[PDB]
Amino acid sequence: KHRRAAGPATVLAIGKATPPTAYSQSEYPDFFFDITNTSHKTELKAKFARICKNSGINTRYFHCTEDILKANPSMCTYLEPSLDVRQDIAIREVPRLAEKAAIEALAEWGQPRDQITHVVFATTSGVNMPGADLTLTRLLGLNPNVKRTMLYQQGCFGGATVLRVAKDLAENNKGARVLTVVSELTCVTFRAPNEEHLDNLVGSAIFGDGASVLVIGSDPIPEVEKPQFEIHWSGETILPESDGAIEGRLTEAGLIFHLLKDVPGLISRNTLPIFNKAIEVAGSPSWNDLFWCVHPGGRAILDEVAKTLSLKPEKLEATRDILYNYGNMSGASVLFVLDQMRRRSAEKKSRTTGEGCEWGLVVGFGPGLTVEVSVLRAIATGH
Amino acid sequence: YKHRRAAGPATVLAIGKATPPTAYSQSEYPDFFFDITNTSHKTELKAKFARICKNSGINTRYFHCTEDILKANPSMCTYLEPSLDVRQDIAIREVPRLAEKAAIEALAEWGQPRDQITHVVFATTSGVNMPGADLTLTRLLGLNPNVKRTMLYQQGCFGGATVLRVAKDLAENNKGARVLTVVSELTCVTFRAPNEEHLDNLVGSAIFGDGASVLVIGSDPIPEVEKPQFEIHWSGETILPESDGAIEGRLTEAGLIFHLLKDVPGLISRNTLPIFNKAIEVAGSPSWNDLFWCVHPGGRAILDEVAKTLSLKPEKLEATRDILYNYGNMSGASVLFVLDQMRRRSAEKKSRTTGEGCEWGLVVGFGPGLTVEVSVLRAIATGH
């Protein structure tokens, strides 16, 4: 009577959404220091400007516009009490941004909403009871019986996480269709620049708002449903020597990231084992024969990953595309990358959804120094 | 395909529990509580709290935040003063530590090497941190750094039922997988001075206590070496009709506050029959009194309403009330304590199954969104 699915969990649709208001990175330091009332801190502003100009970012999207920010002035200070107003905005907007991306994902998938059986929802911005997962269930009018997995305060590796979570949901339940969600806003982290914490200058320069939604299921219906990628393996690891490397603390002033180690370095030195464990399911191809969906944590980390593995510059283009066009959207970013990977393959008429490569890796990293990896099989395009 | 599934139903192989050391007798609590919060002059308020305590079905609760902790963090002893940061500091450190104690007991009952744990599921409602309590627990126990972790923050009173659902698919879809299934709760995020303006906090203050429980769940248990306690055959949940905003839990600069806006005891056992009837289909739809029952001990009244609605024998909800009596409402952990108490009562009485003689049973959690969570369990023959 309990029946399992037959095949691997398959990505059947990918939808995305951002807040409407776009911010050009070149104009951002001006905007930022003006609205936070810190433009008199000349040498701080020259540091942010150089971080911005080297971020590999062209455009970011923010729900919290100048009107929203001036209506909540505590968010425009450095560390004055502000949690309550950041919470009010995030609890309301995080599931609504998800709804928009979901609408698109549900449309591409093309099946009735009542065949969605599970919901997985990850976010790093705000926490509430009931969760964003339940609210999203109401907004979309999903079946009241959906089995929900709500992942609060998940972190930048959250996009890889929901793939791992959805994998087992899809594979262990015949006919299960999983609405797989990551929705991130910067309203819990946004704050005035300050000398006492120069690592916030990076976060302020790279983080933007975004959400992505997938439909994942095993045993896709031929002709009716359209496979994009198959998840063949998910795993994670806690990196060696990485205790306290990134701390994320939710305080009365909102969410603050405290760093105490070499993270760009730590990541490039220690991902070789889990990477090697992962690709084994793929018959261990070489690094340049894999397609790559890496969390665009920063242009520098990407640069380090490429040098460590001697990647051809073409390998991380889909990843850099997202970084360029959207910035670092925390957990959602790598799911945007996955969308971009299939789109690039459509534009170029590649032989697979992995721009011609047969296998690829989805890679997230974040607190604890957690590295999350899924191994994906690309789907033949017919071109 | 090449990925290897397990063959049989997810099975509970061990159940451990832990509480803070300091016990608080319910009969003495209003004196303690109104003194420590400096509200002992609010005579009729204290009289109202006292009557709730004496009727709560609760004898003892455990708290990590003792007098010393509370007087060293005085903001927590007010009503709505800024206090989140110090509640966070306490919860972030103690929640994974309390879980470790319950884990040590579950791991010893299970008796297998720690490196054979493949997954960790961790739920809590008290405090949030990056990295999560799941990672910290992993380090403390010295688990494999490659454990597949599912961290469920801000989960709510149905969190105990949730982790069963979450571990079920992990265990069943992965051959040899062993799931360390954890719920850990402290009340330090909710504790605050009683006040007239919010009388519903007077209830939480009378019933919420501290606790953690930890299970080992796996499919395909090894004969003789591992000892099955219960099989999970079906997990599901539903959002109750017209139950929008019945219980809101808000995390603020003053910590965690709940806001009720409906009759939840009534709403709950009035709307539970559809998921209940669908649930028991897997068990061959036995009658309610032929099922064993592990219900989240939300309050003595909700338990009473469940018994009247379904016309249960007084004996049915005894394991549940045992937990409410000895431990209070420990939010998500409570129903896992109950699950443990059920196999214990069955051992003590020499029952034929780990369900006090019943073949099938229900684990029931309920909470915010007005979510009802249900797993259907098969008990195991004891050999008695």
For position A89, which CATH number holds?
3.40.47.10
CA–CA distances in Å: residue A199 to residues A196, A202, B310 = 9, 6, 59
Question: How many other C-beta atoms are found inside a 10 Å radius of the C-beta of residue B43?
Answer: 10
Do A129 and B156 make contact, defined as CB atoms within 8 angstroms?
A: yes
Between CA B360 and CA B366 the distance in angstroms is 20
Using DSSP, state whether B384 is helix, strand or coil.
Answer: coil
Give the Cβ contact number of residue A107 at 10 Å. 10
The tally of CA atoms less than 13 A away on the side-chain side of residue B41 is: 1
The values of phi and psi at residue A212, to 5°, are -140, 145
Q: Judge contact between A329 and A364, C-beta under 8 A.
A: no
Catalytic residue among A52, A64, A156, A187: A156
A180 shares a domain with A167? yes
Other beta carbons within 10 angstroms of residue A336's beta carbon come to 28
Residue ending a domain, choose from A192, A227, A262: A227
Q: Do B268 and B327 lie in a common domain? A: yes
Looking at beta carbons, which pairs linking A87-92 to residues 24 or more positions away fall under 8 Å? A87/A126, A87/A127, A87/A128, A87/A188, A87/B250, A87/B251, A87/B252, A89/A63, A89/A64, A89/A126, A89/A185, A89/A187, A90/A125, A90/A126, A90/A185, A90/A187, A90/A188, A91/A126, A91/A127, A91/A128, A91/A132
Rounded to the nearest 5 percent, the helix, strand and coil shares of chain A are 40, 25, 35
Residues A217 and A267 both lie in one domain: no
Amino acid at B97: R
Note whether A165 and A247 are same-domain residues. no
* Domain end among A199, A227, A255: A227
Cα–Cα distance measured from residue A303 to residue A307, given in angstroms and rounded to the nearest whole number:
6
Contacts of A115 (CB under 8 A, 6+ apart): A175, A177
Secondary structure (DSSP) of B255-310: EEEEEE-S-HHHHHHHH-HHHHHHHHGGGT---GGGEEEEE----HHHHHHHHHHH
Question: What is the DSSP code (8-state) at residue B368?
Answer: T
| Discontinuities in chain B (C→N > 2.5 Å), after residue | none
Is the CB of residue B81 less than 8 Å away from at least one CB of chain A?
Answer: no
Instruction: Give Cβ neighbours of residue A233 (< 8 Å, ≥ 6 apart).
Output: A278, A281, A374, A375, B3
Most A CBs within 10 Å, among B87, B169, B232, to test the A interface: B169
**Chain B (224-243) residues lying within 8 Å, Cβ to Cβ, of chain A:** 233-239, 241
User: Residue B192 to residues A9, B34, B71, B332: CA-CA distances in angstroms?
Assistant: 46, 10, 13, 20
Cα–Cα nearest to B359, from B379, B330, B381: B379
**Same domain for A274 and A157:** no
List the catalytic residues of B. 157
- Residue A43: which H helix or E strand, with range? helix A42-53
Length of chain A: 383
B7 with B19, same domain: the answer is yes
Please, what's the b/e burial string for A269-287 (b: 16 or more CB within 10 A of its CB; e: otherwise)?
ebbeebbeebbeebeeeeb
Distance from CA of B144 to the nearest CA of A (A): 9
List, as one string, the DSSP characters of A51-101. HHHTSS--EEE-SS-HHHHHHSGGGGSSSSS-HHHHHHHHHHHHHHHHHHH
CA atoms of A33 and B66, how far apart (whole Å): 46
Can you give the C-alpha Rg of chain A in angstroms?
Answer: 20
Q: Say how many C-beta atoms besides its own lie within 10 A of residue A115's C-beta.
A: 14
Residue keyed to tokens 């330091």: A29
Residues A376 and A271 in one domain: yes
CA distances from B281 to A1, B78, B233, B312 (A): 10, 50, 11, 19
Rounded to the nearest 5°, which phi and psi values hold at B331? Answer: 50, -130
Contact A41, A254 (CB under 8 A): no
Is A249 in contact with B154 (Cβ distance < 8 A)? no
**Is B367:B240 a contact under the CB 8 Å cutoff?**
no
**Pair (B170, B30) in one structural domain:** yes
A215 shares a domain with A324: no
Which candidate, A93, A70, A112, places its Cα nearest to that of A185?
A93
Decide if B7 touches A, using CB distance below 8 A: no
Task: List the single residue in A with minimal CA-CA distance to B85.
Answer: A251
CA B372 to chain centre: 14
* Alpha-carbon distance A8 to nearest alpha carbon in chain B (angstroms): 7
- Chain B residues inside the 8 Å CB shell of A234: 148
Same-domain pairing of B180 and B313: no
Specify whether the CB–CB gap between B107 and B16 falls below 8 A: yes
CB-CB contact of A208 with A187 (8 Å):
no
> Cα–Cα distance between B318 and B99 in angstroms, integer?
26
Measured distance CA(B281)–CA(B179) in Å, rounded: 27
Contact map slice: B 126-185 vs A, CB within 8 A: 128-132, 135, 138-139, 145-156, 165-166, 168-170, 172-174
Q: Which residues pair with A60 in a beta bridge?
A: A23
Q: CB of B39 within 8 A of CB of B127?
A: no
| Token couple for B355 | 């369900």
Whether residues B303 and B361 share a domain: the answer is: yes
DSSP one-letter code for A239:
P
Method: X-ray
Beta-carbon-side half-sphere exposure of residue B121 (alpha carbons within 13 Å) = 29
Same domain, B208 and B302: no
Q: Is A293 helix (H, G, I), strand (E, B) or coil?
A: strand
User: For residues B198 and B259, what is the distance between their CA atoms, to the nearest angstrom?
Assistant: 9
Q: Domain boundary residue among A209, A227, A245? A: A227
The rounded distance, in Å, linking the Cα atoms of B310 and B269 is 9
Breakpoints of chain A, after residues (C–N > 2.5 Å): none
And the tokens for B334? 């409570």
> Domain range spanning residue B58?
1-228
Q: Distance (Å, rounded) from C-alpha B67 to C-alpha B28? A: 14
Nearest to B108, CA basis, from B8, B224, B227, B219: B227
Counting the structural domains of chain B, the total is 2
| Residue type (1 letter), B317 | L
